[PDB]
Amino acid sequence: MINQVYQLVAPRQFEVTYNNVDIYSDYVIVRPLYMSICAADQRYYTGDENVLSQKLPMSLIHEGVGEVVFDSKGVFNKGTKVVMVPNTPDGFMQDFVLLNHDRAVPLPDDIDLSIISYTELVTVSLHAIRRFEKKSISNKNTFGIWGDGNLGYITAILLRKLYPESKIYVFGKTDYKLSHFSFVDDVFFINKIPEGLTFDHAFECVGGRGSQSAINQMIDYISPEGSIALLGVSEFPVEVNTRLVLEKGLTLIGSSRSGSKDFQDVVDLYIQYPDIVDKLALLKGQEFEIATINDLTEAFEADLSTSWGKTVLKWIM
């Protein structure tokens, strides 16, 4: 069998190569259905230049869901709709994706797949939350979340669904984005934080040069002996006020890529509280049906220009 892979051969420029696919291997052959563009995929799509020319031809997307078209080992029946887990250290823009049986998680019968496409973000978030030893955290704690974007929103959702009596505060920059947080107890601008505000556990869901600012602020405002979960990637160093981490006894925990246990947990949560899938739906930005190469460039440019939400891709190549 012949697989068409849609690789990036130069920024803002896609081209198609071929490779063979063995129907009868210990993999499960999956056709992607919906898939979402990651910040990480946009770094490559636009632009070190020696690290760029390193993996220079490669497939991009890594957040997606699909149907089982073959399973030679007989585990998943044909057509089973499944969420696709990538490798923790090739991509999904191809006609078929081969997965280990533990790298493919089955979905319920009826479920909006266009919004299940960005389940990797939900796993990243749940992974971070679970880094706080659940025995230490009741629905009597009080959480803070920096960043009014996709990770911010998912984390707010998760804390509210599973720590239901707890308090949640969200800190951001724009009225547009902060209005989406309604199930939160209160919402603040980083510009307009009242003296006297307090919380014991916090989540940094800001990246880039903004992570530095977010971190110093939560260090300053957090109750002493509080813990902080680091989620944002900085791809650079950032100045930290360590004096205060000492004086206050703060614990800072880094959380990154997730494992297939988090994908199974996130699915089992979709089963449990479908409120999540409905709240997650507010993140679905624009959807694109991808039938030619052009239909990709348009989608990537549009995800560049996008204010709020994730850009979904309906795969019909």
Annotated binding site for Zn(2+): 38, 62-63, 120
Q: Would you give the binding string for ligand NDP spanning residues 178-217, x where CB under 6 A is met?
A: ------------x--------------xxxx-x--xx---
Asked whether 59 and 93 are in contact (CB, 8 A), the reply is yes
Stretch that binds ligand NDP, among 4-12, 53-61, 145-153, 284-292 (CB under 6 A): 145-153
Q: Where does residue 60 fall: left (phi above 0), alpha (psi -120 to 50 degrees), or beta otherwise?
A: alpha
- Cβ distance to ligand NDP smaller for residue 63 or 71: 63
3-state secondary structure 228-272: EEECCCCCCCCCCCHHHHHHHCCEEEECCCCCHHHHHHHHHHHHH
291 near ligand NDP (CB under 6 A): no
Backbone angles phi, psi at 306, to 5 degrees: -85, 135
Q: Of the candidates 149, 163, 279, 314, which one interacts with ligand NDP according to CB under 6 A?
A: 149
Structural tokens at position 131: 């880094």
Identify residues 27-86 at the interface with ligand NDP (CB under 6 A): 39
Question: 167-172 and 97-99 as β-strands: parallel, antiparallel, unpaired?
Answer: unpaired
Contact 223, 198 (CB under 8 A): yes
Binding ligand NDP (rule: CB under 6 A), the pick from 66, 147, 203, 219 is 147
Q: Does 124 bind ligand NDP (CB under 6 A)?
A: yes
Residue 288 pairs with which residues in a beta bridge?
313
Considering the complex, state which of residue 23 and residue 240 has its C-beta at the smaller distance from ligand NDP.
240
Task: State the residue for tokens 């070190």.
Answer: 48
**One residue of 5, 33, 104, 231 binding ligand NDP per CB under 6 A:** 231
Least CB distance to ligand NDP at residue 121 (A): 6
Among 66, 86, 152, 226, binds ligand NDP (CB under 6 A): 152
Which residue in the set 177, 201, 284, 314 belongs to the binding site for ligand NDP (CB under 6 A)? 177
Nearer to ligand NDP (CB atom), residue 62 or residue 81:
62
At 241, the amino acid letter reads: N
Closest-CA residue to 42 (of 302, 285, 287, 255): 302
Residues forming contacts to ligand NDP in the complex (CB under 6 A) are 39, 124, 146-152, 171-174, 177, 190, 205-208, 210, 213-214, 231-233, 255-257
